[PDB]
Symmetry: C2
Subunit: 124 residues, 2 copies
């Protein structure tokens, strides 16, 4: 007998925010539409778990535990070339299938998509 | 009449993977337990939506759309001092309440927690 499935993967959508100005507003809207349509197809296929587009890192607030002290700072965890702009939490039969799905995430064309397996293996 | 709530926030858990070796294995296990207990309390309170610990960035695979070409590379989106090691997707009345919850995420003590509002505002 084998443990019964449910391999989940976090598909991280990374892209330079400073380049959304260069992208025509109408095409940017298309990505949003294709994204809703893709999520629906994923849902019907049984892959969809959750997904969200994130607001600018400018809206972020970071909390860091230093000594035993908590410090609050404006902005993201760190300055990076590409910021985390959204994610898709899915379940697939394996990493290869997860990559096939991630390759189709619409917003991913704005930069890249990092596929990371989660630790939790739900099943029996 | 006001639009009816459901403000969601992504609490990103960041920490240097190279320092999990320095953390005593037993204390590391405690964090895992406090984490399960905290998720349960969050669930009962109505804040919990989803949460996952991520496997090492070594298990990551990144997909990037260049010209019209898709390139696959081993590893994360980029090399950073602290890697994204997990997340909590929650809903709170506002950012201040979201920060109060994030300040209590157990794994957050390994580095920092970035709280980012999602774009989607579900309700009516």
């Amino acid at each position: 007998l084998y443990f019964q499935g449910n391999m989940k993967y976090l598909c991280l959508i990374y892209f330079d925010e400073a380049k959304l100005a260069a992208v025509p507003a109408e095409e940017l809207a298309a990505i949003v539409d294709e994204c809703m349509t893709y999520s629906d197809q994923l849902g019907k296929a049984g892959h969809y778990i959750a997904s969200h587009a994130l607001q600018s890192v400018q809206t972020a607030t970071t909390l860091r535990h230093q000594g035993g002290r908590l410090a609050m700072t404006d902005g993201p965890f760190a300055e990076t070339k590409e910021q985390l702009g959204g994610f898709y939490l899915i379940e697939a039969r394996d990493l290869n299938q997860a990559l096939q799905i991630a390759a189709k995430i619409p917003p991913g064309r704005l930069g890249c998509v990092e596929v990371r397996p989660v630790k939790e293996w739900e099943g029996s």
